[PDB]
């Protein structure tokens, strides 16, 4: 009977975390059956504890799975939308910096041969 520490969880394997999940769930059901028949406050607390626990376990499992899929897709564009940047529809729909600044030839020429200079007037 102890609190569950996240890092400790990230230490284990996927198998491990899963087995534990199943165990936890079975625990819960037993416990609710506690509430129903007859039960001690110990069992009541047990409930909330195990619930939160299960959540935590799941959380970890997804962290891992995720970092894995992201790994496979690392390097490619055409990742699954899950992973693609989500900011604003308007954000993604917009032009690039490349395209923002991108300049027609004549322009690059004027920019070279005329441009702007540092000057000072004296008085």
């Amino acid at each position: 009977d102890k609190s569950v520490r996240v890092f400790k969880l990230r230490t284990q394997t996927e198998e491990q975390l899963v087995g534990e999940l199943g165990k936890l769930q079975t625990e819960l059901s037993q416990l609710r059956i506690a509430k129903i028949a007859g039960g001690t406050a110990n069992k009541l607390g047990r409930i909330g504890i195990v619930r939160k626990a299960i959540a935590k376990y799941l959380t970890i499992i997804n962290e891992k799975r995720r970092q894995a899929v992201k790994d496979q897709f690392k390097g490619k564009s055409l990742k699954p939308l899950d992973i693609r940047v989500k900011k604003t529809r308007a954000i993604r729909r917009k032009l690039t910096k490349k395209q923002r600044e991108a300049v027609l030839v004549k322009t690059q020429k004027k920019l070279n041969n005329f441009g702007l200079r540092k000057f000072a007037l004296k008085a």
């Binding site: 004027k110 005329f114 540092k118 000057f119 000072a120 007037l121 004296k122 008085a123």
Partner: protein, 155 residues
């Protein structure tokens, strides 16, 4: 409608409630303009605030007797100055291509203005290289560091 007083002139006849303008921003606005101007100076530091403006006569018979700041220099004038529009622009000079000189004197004023400008000019090229047109002035001018207003220098 009673007395001898002058026939009123209706004002609020329509629904003006939607159409009123309020001036409280003015307070802060002035201030904003200040800081803008100042932040321009700082970002422009070696260069002057207002770009070079030629001068002309005003457009009305009553205004002719007076002097007014033009928007740009006449190509004819840049020619007599010996500057290309493009260059003058890289210098901080203001050019206007639709304006035309119908008088010798109007050429004169602006020539005098341009020349005055150039004479008082300092030009920073890519570091320690020197150049030719409108020319380029010595590296020591970098130390001279002039923050100046155009009315002082070219009046």
């Amino acid at each position: 409608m009673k007395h001898n007083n002058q026939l009123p002139v209706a004002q609020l006849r329509k629904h003006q409630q939607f159409r009123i303008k309020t001036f409280f921003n003015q307070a802060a606005q002035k201030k904003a303009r200040l800081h803008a101007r100042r932040a321009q100076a700082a970002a422009v530091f070696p260069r002057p605030t207002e770009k070079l403006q030629p001068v002309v006569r005003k457009q009305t018979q009553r205004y002719n007797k007076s002097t007014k700041l033009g928007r740009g220099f006449t190509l004819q004038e840049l020619k007599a100055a010996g500057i290309s529009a493009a260059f003058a622009q890289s210098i901080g000079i203001k050019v206007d291509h639709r304006r035309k000189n119908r008088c010798q004197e109007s050429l004169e004023l602006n020539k005098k203005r341009l020349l005055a400008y150039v004479s008082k000019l300092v030009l920073f090229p890519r570091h320690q290289g020197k150049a030719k047109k409108g020319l380029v002035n010595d590296t020591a001018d970098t130390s001279s560091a002039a923050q100046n207003a155009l009315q002082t220098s070219v009046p």
